[PDB]
Amino acid sequence: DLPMPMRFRHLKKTSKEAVGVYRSPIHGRGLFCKRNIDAGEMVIEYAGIVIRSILTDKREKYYDSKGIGCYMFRIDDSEVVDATMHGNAARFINHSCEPNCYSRVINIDGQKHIVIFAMRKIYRGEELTYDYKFKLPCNCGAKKCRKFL
Ligand SMILES: Nc1ncnc2c1ncn2[C@@H]1O[C@H](CN(CC[C@H](N)C(=O)O)CC2CN(CCC(c3ccccc3)c3ccccc3)C2)[C@@H](O)[C@H]1O
Numbered sequence: 722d723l724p725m726p727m728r729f730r731h732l733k734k735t736s737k738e739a740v741g742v743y744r745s746p747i748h749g750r751g752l753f754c755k756r757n758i759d760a761g762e763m764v765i766e767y768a769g770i771v772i773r774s775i776l777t778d779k780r781e782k783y784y785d786s787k788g789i790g791c792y793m794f795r796i797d798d799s800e801v802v803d804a805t806m807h808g809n810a811a812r813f814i815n816h817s818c819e820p821n822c823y824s825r826v827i828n829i830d831g832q833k834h835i836v837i838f839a840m841r842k843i844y845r846g847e848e849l850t851y852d853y854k855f856k857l858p859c860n861c862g863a864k865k866c867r868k869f870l
């Protein structure tokens with residue numbers, strides 16, 4: 722309804738009251754909603770630093786050697802968002818084969834942002850999930866589960 726830049730300009734405050742991080746039955750911790758989220762709604766930005774894809778291997782190797790969890794979102798074959806040090810709650814979003822959210826790379830005022838949108842109405846208590854771009858067995862539990870990430 723509202724143009725994309727107008728919708729993006731409001732998020733930090735609204736995501737603080739709309740979502741929370743708790744233990745997930747899918748894997749480790751996940752992002753869950755604290756209030757009902759309308760279909761199409763901008764939920765949260767996957768916050769972090771945009772880096773070149775070639776740099777990920779050494780960055781992940783650095784984090785792993787320090788026993789620090791590595792949180793990255795692959796934009797595509799050339800860019801990645803590193804949420805390890807400068808991330809927010811969106812870094813805990815788990816994968817699902819019947820997701821209720823989807824990721825989009827939006828470019829507002831010359832700057833790229835990965836934003837998460839609701840695919841359907843999401844009800845309080847539900848875990849927020851998106852289909853990861855990509856091996857590892859899937860634990861989403863959906864009827865139509867692809868069984869791998
Ligand atoms: N549908 C799914 N089915 C099966 N597995 C799934 C599904 N969706 C997501 N995952 C898993 O989550 C990963 C994505 N993840 C999403 C958030 C994650 N739930 C979390 O809690 O961090 C962010 C990455 C996980 N890492 C941190 C790990 C953390 C840890 C390890 C084991 C147990 C608990 C926690 C760790 C912490 C400190 C130091 C070292 C490691 C970043 C996928 O790569 C996959 O492994």
Ligand SMILES: [Zn+2]
Pocket residue numbers: 817818819859860861862863865866867868869
């Ligand atoms: Zn699945």
